[PDB]
Amino acid sequence: SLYKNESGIQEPEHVPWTASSGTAGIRSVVTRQHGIILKVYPQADSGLRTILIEQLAALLNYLLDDYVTQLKSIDKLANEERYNILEMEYAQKRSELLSPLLILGQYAWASNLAEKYCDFDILVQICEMTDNQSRLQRYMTLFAEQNFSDFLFRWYLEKGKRG
Amino acid sequence: SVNLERSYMELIGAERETSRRNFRDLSLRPDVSLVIGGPKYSDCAGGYCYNESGSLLSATRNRFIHWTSYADTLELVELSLDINLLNNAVRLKILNCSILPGGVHICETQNNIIVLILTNQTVHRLILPHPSRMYRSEIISDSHIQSIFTDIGKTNFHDPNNTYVIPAIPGRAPNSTASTAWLSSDGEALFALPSVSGGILVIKMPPRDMEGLVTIAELKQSSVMQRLLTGWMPSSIRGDPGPAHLPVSLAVHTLDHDSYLFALCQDHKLRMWSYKDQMCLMVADMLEYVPVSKDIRQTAGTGHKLRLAYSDTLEILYLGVYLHTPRQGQFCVFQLVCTESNRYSLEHTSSIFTNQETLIDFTFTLSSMNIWALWLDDDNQTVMKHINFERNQAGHWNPVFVNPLPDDDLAIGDEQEPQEAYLECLFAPGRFTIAALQKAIQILRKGSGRVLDLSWEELKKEVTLTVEKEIQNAVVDYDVSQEEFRQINIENWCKFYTCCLQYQETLSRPLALVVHPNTNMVCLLRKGFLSFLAPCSSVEHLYLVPGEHLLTVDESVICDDVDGASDIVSLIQCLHMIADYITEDMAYQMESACCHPQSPERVAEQILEDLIANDIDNIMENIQNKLQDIRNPIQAISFLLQNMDYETNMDMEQSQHNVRLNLSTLYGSVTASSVVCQAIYKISATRFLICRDLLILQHLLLRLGDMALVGAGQLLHSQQELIPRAAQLLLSYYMIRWGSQCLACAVPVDLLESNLQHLSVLELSDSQVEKRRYTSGIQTIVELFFEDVGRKHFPQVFAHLFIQSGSSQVHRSLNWADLIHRITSYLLQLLWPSNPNFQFAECLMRNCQYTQLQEYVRLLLPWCQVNVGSCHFMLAQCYLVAGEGHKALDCFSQAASEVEREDFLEKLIRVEEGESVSPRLQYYNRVLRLLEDVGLPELVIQLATIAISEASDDWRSQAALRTRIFKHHLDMGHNSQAYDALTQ
Amino acid sequence: AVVKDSRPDQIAHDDKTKHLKAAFLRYCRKDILGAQSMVDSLFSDSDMEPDDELDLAVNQISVDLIDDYPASDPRWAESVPEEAAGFSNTSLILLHQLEDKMKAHSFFVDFLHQVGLFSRLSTCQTKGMLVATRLLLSEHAEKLSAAIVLKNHHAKLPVLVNS
Amino acid sequence: SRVYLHPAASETVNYNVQLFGSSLPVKVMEALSNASADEPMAACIHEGGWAWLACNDRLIIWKISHSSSAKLMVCKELPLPLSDSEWSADLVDICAQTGDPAAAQSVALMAATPEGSSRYWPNILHEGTYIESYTEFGSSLCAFVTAVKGNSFILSSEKNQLVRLTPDASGKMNQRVLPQGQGMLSGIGRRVSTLFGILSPAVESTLCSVLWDKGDCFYTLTDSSINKWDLDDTSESQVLNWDMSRVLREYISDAIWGSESDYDDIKAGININYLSLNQNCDGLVILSAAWHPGDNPCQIYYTLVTVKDEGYNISDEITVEVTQFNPVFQARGMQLCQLVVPNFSSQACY
Amino acid sequence: MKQDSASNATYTVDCEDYVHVVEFNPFDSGEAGSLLAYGGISYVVIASCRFQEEDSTVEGIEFKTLKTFHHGERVVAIAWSPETRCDALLPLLRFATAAGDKKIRIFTSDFQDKNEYKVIEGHSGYINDLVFCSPEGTDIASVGDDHTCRIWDLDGKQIAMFILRSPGMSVAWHPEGAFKLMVAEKTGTIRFYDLTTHQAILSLESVQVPLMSADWCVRNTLRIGAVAGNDWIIWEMPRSSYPQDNKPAHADRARMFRWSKCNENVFATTGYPGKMKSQIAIHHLAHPQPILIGTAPVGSGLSWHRRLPLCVVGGYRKLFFWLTEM
């Protein structure tokens, strides 16, 4: 708010370096770091695994906050298709980054990390693939304004949970 | 008789983007309106070239201004050749009077530029900032720069003393198109117009020092004393003139402190008036030098033209007059000479005849005595010619071949495929416009919306989309029939082609002409566009000039010997005969046979056999008679090949970056790039047919016999040795023409950067990141190659040209006639097959155009003998990027098999060959790391096993390859293969 | 008097950038009268126009600030031929220089916000492409912060950061 | 195997629509986008192979010719003269006497402003040579401009004043006022009847249509009579002057409303107007529109009156046939429904 | 935090070397089972593949190799005849193979006892594609990097030559039998010839650069789709070339694009690993999103089954058979 202007002259074509939002940048570095850390979990105790999970969750939350800041900084002026491609590749990079946490586990931590952004399908699937109904109940009570019902019905019909 | 003058060619410029510069609008509201009752004054154009052009640190550098007026609008655009000026377009709107054709003068003063514009009943004096007063420094290496126009502060049109109103007495007769403006020796601004009674109305405004009151003068047949003396008697030659003495053309000449006004009226009486004496002096009859005809009195009302040129080398003024006559126009040149009583007199010089075409424009540059003229005839072939007046009495008039008009019949329906020919003709540059394509898109998509400002790729996309949409809307059939399909296609594509052709002609409607006397260049102002005129090569001018003009052109400029010149003339005549005998179907068959993977000599001999079988007009007999009359064609062929052969071996002079030596600022503009590209395209399109006709004639002479001529001892072997070289040159120029007529993509720089990053991640050789600029309009492969190579090689090309000719410093008058030849020679040296530099394949790989790469390879293969290994390597890279793993591996193997016999591979050292071991092992390790960075564990293992056969002097490298194979076998989960690889 | 009404690029833009940098240095050294006089001689505050020349001048000023150091700073003692690649308090001097550069950038941003040229700031031409001035300033600030963090990390671990 | 067709005419198979090897320039599209055809913009064609359109205050011309695979046409932006009460393409006509795809050898221009000054252009592609002639009109308003053989022009004002303009070999324009009908029951008609001068007791109704027949004949249809002239190269002769102010009126009345008893009181009200005139193998066909203001709603009934014409003078036979074409009536400002005929020996009428 | 999960493991087969070309049968003609002919580094294994959906005596997935050939280089293109045989006293094989040696071999094996081939003149560079342009299985159409579609009979002589302005990138024969031959030129134009008149009966005019592959519906000669860069565009011919179905397929470069031999409005696209792994995407007509999407090791060679909606993908030593919707 001190250096740049909110809702001003923002070109969606160019993206600033260092703290970026999309492909390249520090995203590949974070991916390699997570892949290297993944070789420590099978040779650790419960407390060490919990500490590493908490550290990874904090790092992912900081990365999500930086991504939200970059998205709120980068606005649109006359490149709607460029901004759409940018947000598409940014969501793709998010999906590519979200992999070691889902491979390890900690559904509660993954849900607490993903609830910071505007997402519904991932929360629905992570609440359906587990045996925790209170999480789905609180997600419904929190996002009832965004029609939190169609995704649940679709996931219940596709996954064979017609009962 | 001729000294040194050749024919010219027209090139379409106006940059290359589809988004033109914004026009700053300014509306002027006078008080009085125009008077009708005579000839029209709308649709006119003019120009002004800066006299301080050239050099670098002075005032201007290849810059000029031009203006086009229609009814009430006037668009004034400032254009530069070496650089691009931003914000240089003004649009004046005068809803009252209309701008007269030729009433806009521009003068310079060591403070400002004074623009005096006259209309039917109003005068305006505008003050513009001078380029030298607005600083002048070109030290920073930049491409684009700002012009003198910025906003409303640079222009001004106030001061009632400057925008005076023409009084009712005497007024201005609307039956003439005369108006001139100048500045007196004392600084006063004098505007002369024709009076109603027949005199001259002079509006005089004080100089820029003091602003007093505007004065009105009435120059009549005599002074005020003689007028008052003869007032009580009818007098038309010593008092008040009549309506028959209405001046149609006006010219002025200042001297010391007085001024002489030369007025050409409708009665063919060039009268002379004095400014200070305010009376008529010499009244000469112009009908004595021109043939007296009764058809000139009707055309002298607005068809008579007159221009002036004051050469300061001898302080002499030349007046060029043109009298229009529906039978035949007339030109006249009158030099002004002084006496011993302050009374100048005109003396005749030459009386050049003219056809019945309407003279649109005419100028005469006195720096080299060159009279240029532009006429409109019956057909759309707008004539542009140039000749000298101090050489011949009639003048042969060297022509200027305009832009290539779109072809007529392409493919008759219900016989051949017309859609392909229509699309090829539409995509062929130099006859259509992106604006025309967009307007066709919108008229085929219907609606009241505007579709403009789009890239070339999306443009052709939408073209095809709307064409097939109209096809679908038209068709409602259930059974697809060939005849109905071809009919629908030919109708739709004919509508498209005709709309595009109509807009092309509307844009090519001529207006005026602009000639630069400094760097020697001519500019033609069309409908909102500015084309350039360039001198053609000797062989191109000979091939484009018919025999009627070749007989008038002297033999001293064609060749050094009369016999050689006559032989070249006969050769050109035979080539023209072959060309006019070849029809459109024959040209299509020749193009198809050349595109088909066959032999050029076989295609030529088949065409010759077909022409022999179809010959029934004795044209081949006349060609053979001319060949027999030719004394010795050996020296002629040698000269033709010397004026074409250009090659530089090795790569010891390549430069992919701008060398900071105060040279990158020279040229490099969008206008110059477009002009160079159009010139190269025209040269290739002409040279293709030239080489085709030359090969046909050589084969005909070989079949006739090389033993029935003078000096047959060195003729049979010369033709046999030059036939393969001629075929190779023809194939090379055909490929160049195909690349020039082909298209490309207009993707943004972000896509190119992403592709380069992907290729760097996959690790591909020869993948450099070069930053440049894409145009919003048309974008072709040749244009991209030029803007990517020459824009960075200019610091070396200009440095070589400065030592080859002209001055070594950067403040040298750029001789364009030699600059274009040097550029063409350098392009031929770079694109010669005997030289390496496989930059086109790299530029296609960085753009990810597999189709374009394959289209280039299929045409380069017939005339390819060097860099086959590099070509196979690039093909392997392209196939690996695409998906054809089998073809990629095959090309990789065939490139690794041949690696120690390629110029590019031998030049690229310390990267793929040598380094620390043998070149074979180095290339094997390079391909190994390439496959490792790309992926595919099976392909990586295969390449490792291939490189193992050569990895014998490095046990560490062999063990590393073994470990890589082991880990790649363990990745997919092959325990048996992993153990087998570990046990070795 | 002082020249005015310049054009983008070339010696005109060079002199305009030099004059604006001198005015900024005067404002830093507490010369409000001289700074206001230089601003009025360069571009009046009552002229609201998106000047590409002004955008390019601000971009060049930011580039010079992030690539060098402003006046009245202890960096002159090291700029004097005394050091080459290391000395005594080299880390402390570099940290102080980075802090002074950040403070100068903040002061320049505040001066731009005060004079009102930030509203006229739009975009320019960098690396042959169009990048917004706000995005350029954000990237420069991110690079400065990353360099400060890298220097703070080198103050403890020298080998890896030096490599 | 049917050829190309129109999207709306997909069900029509008897008459096939085909492109004439030429289209329209983009200036027409720009003018239409600025002011669509809902405003009085006038388009005209010329069998010599040309077409033009006048709209707002600008004229645009374009060549058209049948081509098997396209050809080459010329497009010019001819500015319309000033001081015009209304813009219409009926004030500019060319005299193209060719049929080749390059039909531009003998083409001229004659612009006439509603005042008395005429601008003659020897060609559309010869900008720089214009002839300013003064007709016999002091301040009257022009209406139509027809082109007759010998590269001659015929100007007609609002009161039907035929002024023939002929170009000379030098560039001069000769003016000749045609006799404004001699009649058979009125007074003297052999004298000249020119506006802004003297008058003559003859027929001077408003001109409605002009037809330049290729058989050395020129038909002019007003609102009272039909006048047939013969114009060679430098001679004019009024060969026919058939008064049809009441006979054709009662014929059309009996053809349309020929079943009522109060015909004597019904006829006094219908204002029949002959709008179109064409020539076919059967002779001369006059298309007229009739309507009754006292009978709501106002239904425009169309009637074709055919007379036998043997290439020169028409016969005494008259065949009146009433025909309708849909209850709706599309109009660009005024009720327009024109009848066109291609060759003078074909029965096809559109 | 979004998540895009995709796999590729419906019917897995571990071969020997990297698979890059796979084909099936375009039209049905009796037979008894499905044929599989995958090309590797130097081995060609012609086998009779029978999944567990049609045969009840074979559980899971198995294949019996009836022919094993050792080629010189790598297999580039394989063309199967529309009227092949597999029963009635020993199978009868009739196909064509083109490789990097600029030669085409017509393999005709009668009663698995003979194996003859004719030396067919290849193209300039590499053979792009080839098919059997005959309703009974005789003439073959081959296109390569020479813009010269060659129609050659089984006797081994030059039958027909069709010149073009751009090298042919995809040639195909109508399996239903209509004397129509799809030929795509690398310039975006796709021409169609008629064998009864030896003339062009249809020609698509839609310049598009670059291009990867294109295919038309096996049951309707109207819907034609193509793939370019990162998306796929399906139009109607000779209706409109407007992108009636324009949807992005993969995040990297494409490889091929085919249609379902059994369905009518189902097509498939395969990508290439440009930054990760390849993507195999099954799409249905009139759908903004693909009906099936999977992550594969590397996409090379795409085909379809003529009976059940079955697709085949081939990566390094692995063959993945997928069952899509009807």
Side-chain angles (χ1 to χ4, degrees), chain B residues 764-766 873 877 899 905 908-915 918-924 926-927 930:
Chain B
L764 297 197
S765 305
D766 308 334
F873 178 45
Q877 294 173 91
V899 86
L905 294 177
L908 284 168
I909 57 171
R910 287 310 297 258
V911 164
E912 279 180 340
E913 285 183 59
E915 284 190 15
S918 58
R920 292 278 175 168
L921 184 52
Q922 193 48 241
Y923 201 82
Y924 281 158
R926 261 293 189 192
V927 183
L930 189 140

mmCIF file of all heavy atoms in Angstrom, chain B residues 764-766 873 877 899 905 908-915 918-924 926-927 930:
data_model
loop_
_atom_site.group_PDB
_atom_site.id
_atom_site.type_symbol
_atom_site.label_atom_id
_atom_site.label_comp_id
_atom_site.label_asym_id
_atom_site.label_seq_id
_atom_site.Cartn_x
_atom_site.Cartn_y
_atom_site.Cartn_z
ATOM 1 N N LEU B 764 18.266 -27.489 -25.323
ATOM 2 C CA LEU B 764 18.433 -27.637 -26.761
ATOM 3 C C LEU B 764 19.506 -26.673 -27.248
ATOM 4 O O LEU B 764 19.536 -25.506 -26.841
ATOM 5 C CB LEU B 764 17.119 -27.379 -27.508
ATOM 6 C CG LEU B 764 15.954 -28.331 -27.225
ATOM 7 C CD1 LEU B 764 14.904 -28.225 -28.319
ATOM 8 C CD2 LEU B 764 16.443 -29.765 -27.087
ATOM 9 N N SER B 765 20.385 -27.165 -28.116
ATOM 10 C CA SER B 765 21.467 -26.343 -28.633
ATOM 11 C C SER B 765 20.928 -25.281 -29.589
ATOM 12 O O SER B 765 19.880 -25.447 -30.222
ATOM 13 C CB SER B 765 22.507 -27.210 -29.343
ATOM 14 O OG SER B 765 22.986 -28.233 -28.489
ATOM 15 N N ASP B 766 21.668 -24.174 -29.682
ATOM 16 C CA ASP B 766 21.315 -23.046 -30.547
ATOM 17 C C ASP B 766 19.924 -22.507 -30.211
ATOM 18 O O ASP B 766 19.036 -22.431 -31.062
ATOM 19 C CB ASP B 766 21.416 -23.434 -32.025
ATOM 20 C CG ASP B 766 22.752 -24.058 -32.374
ATOM 21 O OD1 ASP B 766 23.748 -23.766 -31.678
ATOM 22 O OD2 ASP B 766 22.809 -24.842 -33.346
ATOM 23 N N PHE B 873 20.229 -32.562 -37.000
ATOM 24 C CA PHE B 873 20.128 -32.304 -35.566
ATOM 25 C C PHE B 873 18.922 -31.428 -35.249
ATOM 26 O O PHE B 873 18.189 -31.687 -34.287
ATOM 27 C CB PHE B 873 21.419 -31.654 -35.065
ATOM 28 C CG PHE B 873 21.399 -31.302 -33.605
ATOM 29 C CD1 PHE B 873 20.916 -32.198 -32.665
ATOM 30 C CD2 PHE B 873 21.870 -30.074 -33.170
ATOM 31 C CE1 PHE B 873 20.901 -31.874 -31.320
ATOM 32 C CE2 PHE B 873 21.857 -29.745 -31.828
ATOM 33 C CZ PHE B 873 21.371 -30.646 -30.903
ATOM 34 N N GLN B 877 15.624 -32.341 -33.033
ATOM 35 C CA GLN B 877 15.108 -31.496 -31.960
ATOM 36 C C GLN B 877 13.638 -31.159 -32.182
ATOM 37 O O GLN B 877 12.834 -31.198 -31.242
ATOM 38 C CB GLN B 877 15.938 -30.217 -31.850
ATOM 39 C CG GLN B 877 17.372 -30.436 -31.404
ATOM 40 C CD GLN B 877 18.204 -29.171 -31.483
ATOM 41 O OE1 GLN B 877 18.287 -28.407 -30.521
ATOM 42 N NE2 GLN B 877 18.820 -28.939 -32.636
ATOM 43 N N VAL B 899 29.213 -36.052 -38.220
ATOM 44 C CA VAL B 899 29.479 -34.917 -37.342
ATOM 45 C C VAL B 899 30.820 -34.250 -37.603
ATOM 46 O O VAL B 899 31.054 -33.131 -37.109
ATOM 47 C CB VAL B 899 29.377 -35.349 -35.861
ATOM 48 C CG1 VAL B 899 30.701 -35.919 -35.375
ATOM 49 C CG2 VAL B 899 28.930 -34.184 -34.986
ATOM 50 N N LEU B 905 28.936 -27.413 -37.454
ATOM 51 C CA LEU B 905 29.411 -28.255 -36.361
ATOM 52 C C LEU B 905 30.901 -28.063 -36.108
ATOM 53 O O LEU B 905 31.351 -28.172 -34.962
ATOM 54 C CB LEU B 905 29.102 -29.723 -36.657
ATOM 55 C CG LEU B 905 27.618 -30.089 -36.696
ATOM 56 C CD1 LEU B 905 27.430 -31.550 -37.072
ATOM 57 C CD2 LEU B 905 26.955 -29.786 -35.360
ATOM 58 N N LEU B 908 31.082 -24.497 -34.280
ATOM 59 C CA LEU B 908 30.605 -24.557 -32.900
ATOM 60 C C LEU B 908 31.536 -25.467 -32.101
ATOM 61 O O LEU B 908 31.323 -26.675 -31.968
ATOM 62 C CB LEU B 908 29.162 -25.040 -32.848
ATOM 63 C CG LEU B 908 28.090 -24.026 -33.256
ATOM 64 C CD1 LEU B 908 26.744 -24.712 -33.432
ATOM 65 C CD2 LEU B 908 27.996 -22.902 -32.235
ATOM 66 N N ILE B 909 32.589 -24.866 -31.562
ATOM 67 C CA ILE B 909 33.563 -25.581 -30.767
ATOM 68 C C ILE B 909 33.340 -25.261 -29.294
ATOM 69 O O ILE B 909 32.643 -24.312 -28.939
ATOM 70 C CB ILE B 909 35.013 -25.251 -31.200
ATOM 71 C CG1 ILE B 909 35.270 -23.746 -31.104
ATOM 72 C CG2 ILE B 909 35.278 -25.759 -32.606
ATOM 73 C CD1 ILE B 909 36.721 -23.362 -31.300
ATOM 74 N N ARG B 910 33.937 -26.073 -28.419
ATOM 75 C CA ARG B 910 33.849 -25.919 -26.968
ATOM 76 C C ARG B 910 32.410 -25.964 -26.460
ATOM 77 O O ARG B 910 32.117 -25.457 -25.372
ATOM 78 C CB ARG B 910 34.533 -24.628 -26.501
ATOM 79 C CG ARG B 910 36.050 -24.667 -26.564
ATOM 80 C CD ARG B 910 36.603 -25.918 -25.899
ATOM 81 N NE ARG B 910 36.294 -25.959 -24.474
ATOM 82 C CZ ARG B 910 37.158 -25.661 -23.512
ATOM 83 N NH1 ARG B 910 38.399 -25.294 -23.787
ATOM 84 N NH2 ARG B 910 36.765 -25.735 -22.243
ATOM 85 N N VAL B 911 31.503 -26.564 -27.229
ATOM 86 C CA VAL B 911 30.101 -26.666 -26.841
ATOM 87 C C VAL B 911 29.609 -28.081 -27.121
ATOM 88 O O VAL B 911 29.060 -28.747 -26.237
ATOM 89 C CB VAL B 911 29.237 -25.624 -27.576
ATOM 90 C CG1 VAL B 911 27.763 -25.988 -27.474
ATOM 91 C CG2 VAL B 911 29.485 -24.233 -27.012
ATOM 92 N N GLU B 912 29.805 -28.546 -28.356
ATOM 93 C CA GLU B 912 29.375 -29.875 -28.760
ATOM 94 C C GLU B 912 30.506 -30.759 -29.265
ATOM 95 O O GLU B 912 30.310 -31.975 -29.377
ATOM 96 C CB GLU B 912 28.297 -29.781 -29.852
ATOM 97 C CG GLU B 912 26.897 -29.515 -29.323
ATOM 98 C CD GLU B 912 25.862 -29.436 -30.428
ATOM 99 O OE1 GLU B 912 26.251 -29.214 -31.594
ATOM 100 O OE2 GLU B 912 24.660 -29.598 -30.132
ATOM 101 N N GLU B 913 31.675 -30.198 -29.569
ATOM 102 C CA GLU B 913 32.801 -30.969 -30.069
ATOM 103 C C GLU B 913 34.085 -30.468 -29.426
ATOM 104 O O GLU B 913 34.255 -29.264 -29.219
ATOM 105 C CB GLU B 913 32.910 -30.878 -31.597
ATOM 106 C CG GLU B 913 31.879 -31.710 -32.344
ATOM 107 C CD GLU B 913 32.064 -31.653 -33.847
ATOM 108 O OE1 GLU B 913 33.148 -32.043 -34.329
ATOM 109 O OE2 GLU B 913 31.124 -31.223 -34.548
ATOM 110 N N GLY B 914 34.980 -31.393 -29.117
ATOM 111 C CA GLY B 914 36.271 -31.048 -28.520
ATOM 112 C C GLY B 914 36.188 -30.976 -26.993
ATOM 113 O O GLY B 914 36.144 -32.009 -26.328
ATOM 114 N N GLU B 915 36.173 -29.752 -26.462
ATOM 115 C CA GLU B 915 36.119 -29.505 -25.025
ATOM 116 C C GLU B 915 37.268 -30.194 -24.299
ATOM 117 O O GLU B 915 38.320 -29.589 -24.074
ATOM 118 C CB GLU B 915 34.775 -29.959 -24.448
ATOM 119 C CG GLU B 915 33.623 -29.016 -24.747
ATOM 120 C CD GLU B 915 32.366 -29.366 -23.973
ATOM 121 O OE1 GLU B 915 32.461 -30.152 -23.009
ATOM 122 O OE2 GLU B 915 31.285 -28.852 -24.329
ATOM 123 N N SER B 918 37.394 -36.445 -27.455
ATOM 124 C CA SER B 918 37.182 -36.470 -28.892
ATOM 125 C C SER B 918 35.865 -35.781 -29.247
ATOM 126 O O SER B 918 34.941 -35.727 -28.429
ATOM 127 C CB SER B 918 37.171 -37.909 -29.402
ATOM 128 O OG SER B 918 36.173 -38.676 -28.752
ATOM 129 N N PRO B 919 35.756 -35.233 -30.462
ATOM 130 C CA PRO B 919 34.489 -34.590 -30.853
ATOM 131 C C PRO B 919 33.319 -35.556 -30.906
ATOM 132 O O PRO B 919 32.190 -35.173 -30.574
ATOM 133 C CB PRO B 919 34.808 -33.999 -32.236
ATOM 134 C CG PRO B 919 35.992 -34.769 -32.725
ATOM 135 C CD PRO B 919 36.787 -35.107 -31.504
ATOM 136 N N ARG B 920 33.559 -36.806 -31.311
ATOM 137 C CA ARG B 920 32.489 -37.799 -31.326
ATOM 138 C C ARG B 920 31.948 -38.042 -29.923
ATOM 139 O O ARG B 920 30.733 -38.025 -29.700
ATOM 140 C CB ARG B 920 32.995 -39.103 -31.945
ATOM 141 C CG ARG B 920 33.300 -39.013 -33.431
ATOM 142 C CD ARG B 920 32.036 -39.157 -34.263
ATOM 143 N NE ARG B 920 32.293 -38.951 -35.684
ATOM 144 C CZ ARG B 920 31.432 -39.240 -36.651
ATOM 145 N NH1 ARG B 920 30.241 -39.753 -36.385
ATOM 146 N NH2 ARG B 920 31.774 -39.009 -37.915
ATOM 147 N N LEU B 921 32.846 -38.268 -28.960
ATOM 148 C CA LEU B 921 32.416 -38.475 -27.581
ATOM 149 C C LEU B 921 31.768 -37.225 -26.999
ATOM 150 O O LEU B 921 30.821 -37.330 -26.211
ATOM 151 C CB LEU B 921 33.603 -38.911 -26.720
ATOM 152 C CG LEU B 921 33.298 -39.267 -25.263
ATOM 153 C CD1 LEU B 921 32.163 -40.275 -25.180
ATOM 154 C CD2 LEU B 921 34.543 -39.798 -24.569
ATOM 155 N N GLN B 922 32.254 -36.041 -27.378
ATOM 156 C CA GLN B 922 31.646 -34.807 -26.888
ATOM 157 C C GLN B 922 30.219 -34.654 -27.400
ATOM 158 O O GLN B 922 29.312 -34.308 -26.634
ATOM 159 C CB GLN B 922 32.497 -33.604 -27.293
ATOM 160 C CG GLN B 922 32.131 -32.318 -26.572
ATOM 161 C CD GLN B 922 31.988 -32.509 -25.074
ATOM 162 O OE1 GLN B 922 30.921 -32.278 -24.507
ATOM 163 N NE2 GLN B 922 33.068 -32.933 -24.427
ATOM 164 N N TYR B 923 29.998 -34.916 -28.691
ATOM 165 C CA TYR B 923 28.647 -34.854 -29.238
ATOM 166 C C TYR B 923 27.755 -35.926 -28.625
ATOM 167 O O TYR B 923 26.566 -35.686 -28.375
ATOM 168 C CB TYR B 923 28.688 -34.995 -30.761
ATOM 169 C CG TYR B 923 27.459 -34.459 -31.459
ATOM 170 C CD1 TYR B 923 27.323 -33.102 -31.722
ATOM 171 C CD2 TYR B 923 26.436 -35.309 -31.854
ATOM 172 C CE1 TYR B 923 26.201 -32.607 -32.360
ATOM 173 C CE2 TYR B 923 25.311 -34.824 -32.494
ATOM 174 C CZ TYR B 923 25.198 -33.473 -32.744
ATOM 175 O OH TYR B 923 24.079 -32.985 -33.380
ATOM 176 N N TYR B 924 28.311 -37.114 -28.369
ATOM 177 C CA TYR B 924 27.532 -38.170 -27.732
ATOM 178 C C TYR B 924 27.098 -37.763 -26.329
ATOM 179 O O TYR B 924 25.939 -37.961 -25.949
ATOM 180 C CB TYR B 924 28.337 -39.466 -27.694
ATOM 181 C CG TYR B 924 28.340 -40.222 -29.005
ATOM 182 C CD1 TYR B 924 29.344 -41.133 -29.302
ATOM 183 C CD2 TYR B 924 27.337 -40.022 -29.944
ATOM 184 C CE1 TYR B 924 29.350 -41.825 -30.499
ATOM 185 C CE2 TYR B 924 27.335 -40.709 -31.145
ATOM 186 C CZ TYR B 924 28.344 -41.609 -31.417
ATOM 187 O OH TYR B 924 28.345 -42.296 -32.609
ATOM 188 N N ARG B 926 26.773 -34.691 -25.290
ATOM 189 C CA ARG B 926 25.815 -33.598 -25.444
ATOM 190 C C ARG B 926 24.414 -34.134 -25.709
ATOM 191 O O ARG B 926 23.440 -33.696 -25.084
ATOM 192 C CB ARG B 926 26.261 -32.667 -26.572
ATOM 193 C CG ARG B 926 26.981 -31.416 -26.097
ATOM 194 C CD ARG B 926 26.044 -30.499 -25.328
ATOM 195 N NE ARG B 926 26.653 -29.204 -25.050
ATOM 196 C CZ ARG B 926 26.154 -28.305 -24.211
ATOM 197 N NH1 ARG B 926 25.030 -28.529 -23.549
ATOM 198 N NH2 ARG B 926 26.797 -27.155 -24.035
ATOM 199 N N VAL B 927 24.292 -35.093 -26.629
ATOM 200 C CA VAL B 927 22.986 -35.692 -26.889
ATOM 201 C C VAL B 927 22.495 -36.465 -25.670
ATOM 202 O O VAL B 927 21.289 -36.503 -25.392
ATOM 203 C CB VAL B 927 23.043 -36.584 -28.145
ATOM 204 C CG1 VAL B 927 21.670 -37.158 -28.454
ATOM 205 C CG2 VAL B 927 23.557 -35.790 -29.333
ATOM 206 N N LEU B 930 21.155 -33.934 -23.307
ATOM 207 C CA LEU B 930 19.918 -33.438 -23.899
ATOM 208 C C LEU B 930 18.758 -34.382 -23.606
ATOM 209 O O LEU B 930 17.696 -33.955 -23.138
ATOM 210 C CB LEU B 930 20.103 -33.259 -25.407
ATOM 211 C CG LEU B 930 19.005 -32.549 -26.203
ATOM 212 C CD1 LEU B 930 19.623 -31.637 -27.250
ATOM 213 C CD2 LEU B 930 18.068 -33.554 -26.857
#
